[PDB]
C-alpha cells in the first residue's frame, strides 16, 4: 500500500540508509508492494530459516535424522550462542539445533547445522537448485554479519528471499511434516520481537526470523496474516545505518505497523 512506501522512505531518511521491502500474496506469490526489491542486502540471521530448510530437505530425503546427536567443543562457541553454550558436554540433536538457531538466533547452532549440510557453499547450492538465483552464503557466524561496503558475500535481495520463503513454507518442496516443523520453529515465542511481533494483531499468525549484524544490517522475513493463518510474506532489510539500534528497530517496526494498518 502506498502508505507503507511512505513509511519505508521515512525510515531511509531517519536511518540514513537504504531499506528494501517486499510483500507477496502467500497463495499466489503476486507482488503486492515493493521498494528496492532487487537491491542486495546482507542476510544476517534471516539465513537461519534457509539453513533449516536445507536440513529438513535432507531429512525428507533420508539423508539426515532430526534426532541425530551433535557433539561439539568450547572452541566452536561463538558470540550470541545462548543455547549451545549450555550443551558442551551433552551435545544437541539436529532438531534442538534448528530450534535454537531459529527461535533463539543461536550462532553456534547455525554453524553446527552448516557443518551438517557441508557448509555455506552447500546451502548456496540448495538455494540454486530450488530456483533462487540470488541468495548466497559465503561465511559462517559471526563473520557473515560483517556488512562491509561493496561486499557481495552473504547477501540476498528482498524479492529472492521472499520467493524462497514462500517455496519453503507452502507447496511441496518440503514434506508436510517438514513444512509444519519449519513453521513451528518460526512461530515459537521468542524473548523479544520488536520488528513485527510488536505490531501484529491478536489472533494473527506470524512465523518470522529476524537478523541483526554489523554496520547497520537489520532484517526480518515473515509469513503473517489474520485469523491464525498466514496470507502474506513480508521481507524488510536495511544496512549501513549508524543510528542507534533502538532507532533502527523503531523505524522498521513502524513499517510493520503501516502494513498492518493498511492491510
Ligand atoms: Cl523501487
Ligand atoms: Cl530494485
Ligand atoms: Cl566497510
Ligand atoms: Cl523481531
Ligand atoms: Cl545502539
Ligand atoms: Mg535524522
Ligand atoms: Mg567432543
Ligand atoms: Mg541471474
Ligand atoms: Mg506468542
| Catalytic positions, written as ranges | 45
Give the DSSP per-residue string, 23-39: EEETTT--EEEEESTTS
Method: X-ray
133 Cα–ligand 1 center, Å: 20
> Which ligand does the CA of 228 lie closest to?
9
123 neighbors 50 (Cβ within 8 angstroms): yes
| Three-state secondary structure call for residue 221 | strand
- 229 annotated ligand binder: no
Residue 144 · residue 138 · CB < 8 Å: yes
Crossing angle, helix 176-187 and helix 47-60, to 10 degrees? Answer: 150
Question: Is 209 annotated for ligand binding?
Answer: yes
Was 133 annotated as part of a binding site?
A: no
28 CA from centroid of ligand 1 (Å) = 21
**SS3 state of residue 213:** coil
Q: Report the helix count and the strand count for the chain, using DSSP H and E.
A: 8, 9
The span from the CA of 185 to the CA of 124, in Å, is 22
DSSP 56-122: HHHHHTTS--TT-EE---GGG--SS-TTGGG-TTT-EEHHHHHHHHHHS--HHHHHHHHHHHT-HHH
Distance CA(53)–CA(163), nearest Å, equals 13
CATH of the domain at 17: 3.40.710.10
Per the rule left: phi > 0, alpha: psi between -120 and 50, beta: everything else, 240 is left
Query: Domain limits at 158?
Result: 1-263
In the DSSP assignment, the letter for residue 123 is H
- Number of domains, the chain: 1
Ligand 8 centroid – CA 156 distance (Å): 12
Q: How many other C-beta atoms lie within 10 A of the C-beta of residue 201?
A: 12
Q: Which three cell numbers stand for residue 91?
A: 551435545
14 alpha carbon – ligand 6 mean position (Å): 5
Amino acid at each position: 500500500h502506498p502508505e507503507t512506501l511512505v513509511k519505508v522512505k521515512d525510515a531511509e531518511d531517519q536511518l540514513g540508509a537504504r531499506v528494501g521491502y517486499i510483500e507477496l500474496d502467500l497463495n499466489s506469490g503476486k507482488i503486492l508492494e515493493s521498494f528496492r526489491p532487487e537491491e542486495r542486502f546482507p542476510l544476517t540471521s534471516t539465513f537461519k530459516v534457509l539453513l533449516c530448510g536445507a536440513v529438513l530437505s535432507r531429512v525428507d530425503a533420508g539423508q539426515e535424522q532430526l534426532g541425530r546427536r551433535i557433539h561439539y567443543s568450547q572452541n566452536d562457541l561463538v558470540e550470541y550462542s545462548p543455547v549451545t553454550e549450555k550443551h558442551l558436554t551433552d551435545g544437541m540433536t539436529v532438531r534442538e539445533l534448528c530450534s535454537a538457531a531459529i527461535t533463539m538466533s543461536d550462532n553456534t547452532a547455525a554453524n553446527l547445522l552448516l557443518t551438517t549440510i557441508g557448509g555455506p557453499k552447500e546451502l548456496t547450492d540448495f538455494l540454486r537448485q530450488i530456483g533462487d538465483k540470488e541468495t548466497r552464503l559465503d561465511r559462517i557466524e559471526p563473520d557473515l554479519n560483517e556488512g562491509k561496503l561493496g561486499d557481495l558475500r552473504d547477501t540476498t535481495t528482498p524479492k529472492a528471499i521472499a520467493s524462497t520463503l514462500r517455496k519453503l513454507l507452502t507447496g511441496e518442496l518440503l514434506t508436510l511434516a517438514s513444512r509444519q516443523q519449519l513453521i513451528d520453529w518460526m512461530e515459537a515465542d521468542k524473548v523479544a520481537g520488536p520488528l513485527l511481533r510488536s505490531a501484529l494483531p491478536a489472533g494473527w499468525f506470524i512465523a518470522d526470523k529476524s537478523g541483526a549484524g554489523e554496520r547497520g544490517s537489520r532484517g526480518i522475513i515473515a509469513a503473517l496474516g489474520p485469523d491464525g493463518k498466514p496470507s502474506r510474506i513480508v521481507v524488510i532489510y536495511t544496512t549501513g545505518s549508524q543510528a542507534t539500534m533502538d532507532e533502527r528497530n523503531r523505524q522498521i517496526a513502524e513499517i510493520g505497523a503501516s502494513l498492518i494498518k493498511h492491510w
